[PDB]
Amino acid sequence: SPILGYWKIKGLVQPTRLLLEYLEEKYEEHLYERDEGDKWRNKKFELGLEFPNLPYYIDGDVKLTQSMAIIRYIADKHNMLGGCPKERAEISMLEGAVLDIRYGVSRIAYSKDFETLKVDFLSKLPEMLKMFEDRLCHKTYLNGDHVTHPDFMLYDALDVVLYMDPMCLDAFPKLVCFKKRIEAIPQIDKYLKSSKYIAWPLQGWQATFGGGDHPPKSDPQQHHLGGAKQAGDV
Amino acid sequence: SPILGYWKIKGLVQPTRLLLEYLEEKYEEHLYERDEGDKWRNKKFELGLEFPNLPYYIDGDVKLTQSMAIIRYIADKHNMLGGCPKERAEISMLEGAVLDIRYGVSRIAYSKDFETLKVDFLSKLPEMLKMFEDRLCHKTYLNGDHVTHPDFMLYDALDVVLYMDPMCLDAFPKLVCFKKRIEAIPQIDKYLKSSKYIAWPLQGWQATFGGGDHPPKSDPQQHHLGGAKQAGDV
Numbered sequence: 001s002p003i004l005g006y007w008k009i010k011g012l013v014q015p016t017r018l019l020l021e022y023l024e025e026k027y028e029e030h031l032y033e034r035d036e037g038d039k040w041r042n043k044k045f046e047l048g049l050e051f052p053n054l055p056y057y058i059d060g061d062v063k064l065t066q067s068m069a070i071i072r073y074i075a076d077k078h079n080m081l082g083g084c085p086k087e088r089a090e091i092s093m094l095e096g097a098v099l100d101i102r103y104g105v106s107r108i109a110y111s112k113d114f115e116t117l118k119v120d121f122l123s124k125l126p127e128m129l130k131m132f133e134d135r136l137c138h139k140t141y142l143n144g145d146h147v148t149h150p151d152f153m154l155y156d157a158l159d160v161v162l163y164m165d166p167m168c169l170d171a172f173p174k175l176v177c178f179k180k181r182i183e184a185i186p187q188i189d190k191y192l193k194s195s196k197y198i199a200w201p202l203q204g205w206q207a208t209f210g211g212g213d214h215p216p217k218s219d220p221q222q223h224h225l226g227g228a229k230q231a232g233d234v
Numbered sequence: 235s236p237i238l239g240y241w242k243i244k245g246l247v248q249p250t251r252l253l254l255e256y257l258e259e260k261y262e263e264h265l266y267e268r269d270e271g272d273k274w275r276n277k278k279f280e281l282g283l284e285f286p287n288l289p290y291y292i293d294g295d296v297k298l299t300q301s302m303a304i305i306r307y308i309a310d311k312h313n314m315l316g317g318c319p320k321e322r323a324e325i326s327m328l329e330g331a332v333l334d335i336r337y338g339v340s341r342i343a344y345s346k347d348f349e350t351l352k353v354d355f356l357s358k359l360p361e362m363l364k365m366f367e368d369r370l371c372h373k374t375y376l377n378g379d380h381v382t383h384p385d386f387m388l389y390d391a392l393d394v395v396l397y398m399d400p401m402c403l404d405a406f407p408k409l410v411c412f413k414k415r416i417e418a419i420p421q422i423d424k425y426l427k428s429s430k431y432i433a434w435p436l437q438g439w440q441a442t443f444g445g446g447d448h449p450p451k452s453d454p455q456q457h458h459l460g461g462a463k464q465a466g467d468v
């Protein structure tokens with residue numbers, strides 16, 4: 001059975017976990033705890049990875065690193081990347097646009113002066129969310145009536161920014177509905193309430209925002225889940 | 235002919251320019267000069283782009299944004315993405331590993347503390363480069379006998395880090411050989427010596443590193459390219 005290795009946090013791999021659950025695909029996870037950085041380093045170069053890094057995905061005759069290569073690989077095995085160059089480009093564009101939001105958070109989540117850097121991030125966020133809001137006019141998912149991996153990437157991004165600003169989706173009803181729609185998918189609903197769900201942290205434990213072993217205050221605001229704030233996976 | 239829009243700098247789109255030249259695909263560029271930020275802003279939402287941004291690519295079949303969606307699209311139409319999920323994942327992994335280096339630069343290039351932040355980046359750069367050095371063992375290009383888009387992304391990354399650390403490739407003979415081989419490709423040699431080549435800046439003009447109108451002194455480390463330290467185009 002395939003192995004997905006990463007820190008026991010949402011971070012870069014959460015969208016991949018969501019896609020795997022969405023596809024109801026069987027996989028095992030090697031979860032590195034907060035103080036297991038030493039364990040990681042001792043195995044980093046003994047796994048047969050050509051470009052050692054976290055996350056990594058190992059299955060039948062396939063050893064991969066790079067979060068985006070991994071999530072795209074899983075989608076590709078289920079014929080979800082796109083039927084022609086144009087559609088594949090549309091999917092990669094959506095992908096990159098979600099990354100601008102998600103990485104936008106991580107870019108300043110570890111800074112000592114997060115409280116001041118966010119005011120700017122949150123001022124540029126509406127413009128970014130608006131494009132997804134418009135994309136969803138008459139569309140159930142990004143790309144139409146069918147689910148694609150960027151939907152899970154966007155979901156992850158929405159989950160994270162909601163913590164930073166619980167009201168950032170007030171002017172975007174379609175995005176609110178989108179979030180609920182993903183959570184309403186049977187396999188996802190079950191997963192979010194399961195013991196394998198990792199609700200926190202959002203970033204690496206050391207982060208000023210979305211860090212720590214448990215959700216602090218002035219951030220933990222995002223309804224509809226199952227809990228598991230105390231990690232819970234191993 | 236397709237239209238490629240971006241600032242008149244290398245930045246996010248240089249690898250794409252290199253790919254188009256390699257393919258000898260005819261294209262036109264809409265280059266935004268140092269002072270044309272408002273020209274861009276006045277047209278940003280008037281081009282039909284679903285996710286307005288720079289770079290943008292427009293042809294008879296699509297209107298795209300997101301640099302990676304664009305370079306992948308061009309590669310996809312030229313049968314360079316991979317024949318199966320395993321190979322496509324390999325390419326995407328190569329792609330992501332190159333981005334850790336290229337974005338590693340961009341993430342600190344605008345900081346006022348660049349000069350110090352680069353210490354940590356340069357400390358980790360050797361390990362990143364080594365992965366590519368090993369990959370090139372017994373291979374002409376990153377994916378073997380045939381060129382793929384990550385080759386041009388890597389070329390761009392090498393060009394850029396050479397400016398930050400002129401000595402960073404000394405311990406990597408394969409990478410130096412690789413860089414010469416890319417510069418040896420007829421279409422690339424011609425491009426690098428043409429008036430369309432934008433040798434500088436590497437980042438936005440306002441960047442601490444790779445900014446300004448011309449390259450700094452002593453640090454310039456990368457030849458086989460046309461002079462025009464400025465830029466020169468339209």
Ligand SMILES: N[C@@H](CCC(=O)N[C@@H](CS)C(=O)NCC(=O)O)C(=O)O
Pocket residue numbers: 011012044052053054055065066067068330331334
């Ligand atoms: N571009 C890579 C980034 C990989 C990365 O930065 N991983 C960090 C955590 S966010 C890590 O702990 N890597 C393990 C290492 O550096 O050895 C990806 O998307 O997978």
Ligand SMILES: N[C@@H](CCC(=O)N[C@@H](CS)C(=O)NCC(=O)O)C(=O)O
Pocket residue numbers: 096097100245246278286287288289299300301302
């Ligand atoms: N993730 C995007 C980044 C796009 C981006 O942020 N572009 C910057 C230049 S590095 C820009 O000036 N965008 C135009 C804008 O924001 O209006 C990509 O890879 O294309």
